[PDB]
Amino acid sequence: KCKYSFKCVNSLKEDHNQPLFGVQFNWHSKEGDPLVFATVGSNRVTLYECHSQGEIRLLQSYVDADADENFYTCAWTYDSNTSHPLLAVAGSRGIIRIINPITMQCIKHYVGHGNAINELKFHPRDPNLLLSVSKDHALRLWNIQTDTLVAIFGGVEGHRDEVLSADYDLLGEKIMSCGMDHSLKLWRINSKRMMNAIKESYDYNPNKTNRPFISQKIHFPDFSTRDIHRNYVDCVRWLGDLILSKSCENAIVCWKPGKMEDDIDKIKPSESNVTILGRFDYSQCDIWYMRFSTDFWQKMLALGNQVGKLYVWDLEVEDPHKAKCTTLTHHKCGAAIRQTSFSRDSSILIAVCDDASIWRWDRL
């Protein structure tokens, strides 16, 4: 069976009784500091600290001025000069907030077109490069060091409906996005053009110049498919050169562009084939906006469903379809799980729910 066994050690619930839409552990936390995770739901973000005996210690929240803000997503990075962690949050107002997680001060914020942001992701090798996916059909890439919009990934050949999820590949050379138009789309960011644009974003200082920073309008993905799912594609991750993606059809598909022997870096915009390498089925998850996560090493994969059941897959197997499943249930956990998060060391798994409950599963 599955190499990984968890026991439920604690549970709690936030005062607001709104859905907790996102949970992220901080993977940039220093050696010897306790494991910290952030939740988003309602118009706030909250930080907790994990301790022994399953204790989840409440710290401090950032509550938005606007009572109409609903936070959907968060991501951790760090300040590239001082070593300090940063937390970006976003939601329905379409405003990105950079939060100092110590004081919970909002350091600065970015405004796109002001339409819901569904997901945020930081570059795996550049802590400054923030990617946001939006209800307005577009993805934007930001440089949060020089406070510049590097590019908009949109256009007619872009997504024709909400973008719900996106992921950088390992070296942060290409992005794969997905959304309500049933399509998964590839956008390379290692082209001459984009590497140059990123470099220019680093040279830009508004006080040393007269020009505004000109962003790139990227209107053509480098690959596209609608052959994986038959509904809203709400979650995507890279597993090396392979893709893991889901819709609301109770399945996580493992797939790649082109035929079996096709190299990912040789795939052209016209490519018409994909190759299904496997599919992990589960039950009762046919609402949309239900995100799986993986641990740091990508050894395992966790997904909650709509009645409070957790699925964990052991990916540490020769081929994708050989993955080992185990399930985590609790009698008092009955509300929908929106997202899971592993700690960096993999000893703790956190699930969050539509009833504002938080569930802590510790690894045996």
């Binding site: 609402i287 949309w288 539509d354």
Partner: peptide, 8 residues
Amino acid sequence: ARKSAGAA
């Protein structure tokens, strides 16, 4: 396809 149990 709803975000939650009977939505819009």
